[PDB]
Amino acid sequence: DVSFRLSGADPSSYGMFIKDLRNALPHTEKVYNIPLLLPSVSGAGRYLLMHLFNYDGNTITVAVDVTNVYIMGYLALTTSYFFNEPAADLASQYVFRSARRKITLPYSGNYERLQIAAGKPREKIPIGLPALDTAISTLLHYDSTAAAGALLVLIQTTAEAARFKYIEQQIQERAYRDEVPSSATISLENSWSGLSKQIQLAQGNNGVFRTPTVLVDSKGNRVQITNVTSNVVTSNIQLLLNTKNI
C-alpha cells in the first residue's frame, strides 16, 4: 500500500508519495530507461491500495490497477464505490469486499464521462493539494455529481502526477493554492497512451516515433515529438503503458 496525509503536507511529502506510488507499480523491463508497466496481473495483486487522509485525518482507500494506473474505485468507511465499467466491476471482485454496501457510480471513469457528470471540463476545475483535501472530503459521503469533480481532482493529483514528472511539479507548485491545470498538463494527460506506444515502437525504429505526437509546452506553444531524445521522453514521462494494453 501507499499513503499520503494532507495534514502537514508540503511539496516534499507530496513528492515522496508520488515516488512511493510509482515504486509500487511492478515492471520486468525498462524501455529507454522508463519502467514498462506489465501486460497483465492476475487476482488481487492487480490492485494497489492508496490511503489518502484529508487535513482532518479522515480517510479513503483508492484502488488503482497497477498495469495502467487506472483508478477503479474507493472505500469510504463502510461503503465501496466503483466506476460503471467492466474493469471496475472486475476490481470489485477483489478489493473492499468487506464493505457493508457497494455503490456503482453512475458513470465510467474516463475523463469525458466524468466531465459530463461534473458539468465542467478539467480546464475549469482547479487542482492542487487543497483541491485534493476537498476531494477526499467529498468522497467520504455519497454525492454522485460532487464526486465526479472530486474524482477529476483525485485522478490528476495522483495517477497523472505518477505518470509525468511535469504534472507532479505542477501539483507541488499548487501545494497551498489551487489553480486550473496548465494547457501542457491537459496535453500530457491526453497523450500518455500515445506516448507510451511510440516510445515502445521506437525500440526497433532507431529511437524514432512511427507517428509523431503533438503536444503543448510549458510556454503554451504547440511542439511535435518525433523521437526519444525529446525532453518528454528523457525527463518527463515516468511510466509506460504496455502496448499490449493499447
Binding site: 511535469y166 507548485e173 503554451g220
Partner: peptide
C-alpha cells in the same frame, strides 16, 4: 521537462 503554472 518544462514547468510552472497555467
Amino acid at each position: 521537462s518544462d514547468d510552472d503554472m497555467g
